[PDB]
């Protein structure tokens, strides 16, 4: 199964543009120093993947300073598998009212064949000004596995 | 001074290093104050504030009106905002924001305390919110942000 989940997650790239996010309300995973991480949920737009949850991670900042070398990582229980696709970028500019704000996106795929409730551990690394922060935390406000295919 | 004749184009504003202030934050709708100095060297007495409105809501927010009042010892003027609607938040594209320039005249250099009246609509749900903001930087530092 881990080999069948693994085989099913290998190679595949689900492009940002092909995802149709559900109105499920976004979950705010981190929100400190003007830096937030949000999770939007979507159905896997590829066939035969009702047991796969797509998570579009959005990283935003209203900080007065730039944020550099951003890396968001995630871990999950052995019964299921998570894969992160490369992020769109790794930096955010200081807030600039002249222009529209910016965002980093990162597509997460979560294969949960046994349809067990999801409990995710994240790790966040970012540099603001001159201190590198190393945050970690938990997320569990995921939509119920049985719906995943109708989001 | 009156702010009747004073205008500060958005493009001329340089963001300070001062931590912004979150003034409203409900239903995924946030209004933040970012401070700046007065590019117009008429005097050191006016405080420029850029008001940013951002939404992470899954529906659009329409009919957005941010108003403000201040004690009679000072004046406040709000230039026309960049818009009056925000789209539903959509992670597939870049985010959106409204901005509105707010000017504060405070010659007596007392502690600024402001009151806002924010109205907007989310679908058919209507919002009539009020509040206060009293975390402006000390007026002694308005000429050096």
From Swiss-Prot, chain A:
Changing residue 82 to E: Abolishes interaction with CCDC91. The keyword Phosphoprotein applies. It is found in: Golgi apparatus, trans-Golgi network membrane; Endosome membrane; Early endosome membrane. It comes from the Eukaryota. Ubiquitously expressed. Transmembrane segments: none annotated. GO terms for biological process: Golgi to plasma membrane protein transport; Golgi to plasma membrane transport; intracellular protein transport; positive regulation of protein catabolic process; protein catabolic process; protein localization; protein localization to cell surface; protein localization to ciliary membrane. GO terms for cellular component: cytosol; early endosome; early endosome membrane; endosome membrane; Golgi apparatus; intracellular membrane-bounded organelle; membrane; nucleoplasm. Phosphorylated by CK2 and dephosphorylated by PP2A. Phosphorylation of GGA1 allows the internal DXXLL motif to bind the VHS domain and to inhibit the recognition of cargo signals. One of its GO terms (molecular function) is ubiquitin binding. Keywords: Acetylation, Endosome, Golgi apparatus, Membrane, Phosphoprotein, Protein transport, Transport, Ubl conjugation. Residues 22-143 form the GAE domain. The VHS domain functions as a recognition module for sorting signals composed of an acidic cluster followed by two leucines (DXXLL motif). Monomer. Interacts with GGA2 and GGA3. Binds to clathrin and activated ARFs, including ARF1, ARF5 and ARF6. Interacts with RABEP1. Interacts with RABGEF1. Interacts with the type-I membrane proteins LRP3, M6PR/CD-MPR and IGF2R/CI-MPR. Interacts (via N-terminal VHS domain) with SORL1/sorLA and SORT1 (via C-terminal cytosolic domain). Interacts with EPN4. Interacts with CCDC91. Interacts with HEATR5B/p200a. Interacts with SYNRG/gamma-synergin. Interacts (via GAE doamin) with NECAP1 and NECAP2. Interacts (via GAE domain) with AFTPH/aftiphilin. Interacts with TSG101 and UBC. Interacts with RNF11. Belongs to the GGA protein family. Plays a role in protein sorting and trafficking between the trans-Golgi network (TGN) and endosomes. Mediates the ARF-dependent recruitment of clathrin to the TGN and binds ubiquitinated proteins and membrane cargo molecules with a cytosolic acidic cluster-dileucine (DXXLL) motif. Mediates export of the GPCR receptor ADRA2B to the cell surface. Required for targeting PKD1:PKD2 complex from the trans-Golgi network to the cilium membrane. Regulates retrograde transport of proteins such as phosphorylated form of BACE1 from endosomes to the trans-Golgi network. This is ADP-ribosylation factor-binding protein GGA1. It comes from Homo sapiens.
């Amino acid at each position: 199964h881990h080999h069948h989940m693994e085989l099913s997650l290998a190679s595949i790239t689900v492009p940002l543009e092909s995802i149709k996010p559900s109105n499920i309300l976004p979950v705010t995973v981190y929100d400190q120093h003007g830096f937030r991480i949000l999770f939007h949920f979507a159905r896997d737009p590829l066939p035969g993947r009702s047991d796969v949850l797509v998570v579009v991670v959005s990283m935003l900042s209203t900080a007065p300073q730039p944020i550099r070398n951003i890396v968001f990582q995630s871990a999950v229980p052995k019964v299921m598998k998570v894969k992160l696709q490369p992020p769109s970028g790794m930096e955010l500019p200081a807030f600039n009212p002249i222009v529209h704000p910016s965002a980093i996106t990162q597509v997460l795929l979560l294969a949960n064949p046994q349809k067990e409730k999801v409990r995710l551990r994240y790790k966040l690394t970012f540099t603001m000004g001159d201190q590198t922060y190393n945050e970690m935390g938990d997320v569990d406000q995921f939509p119920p596995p049985e719906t995943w295919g109708s989001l």
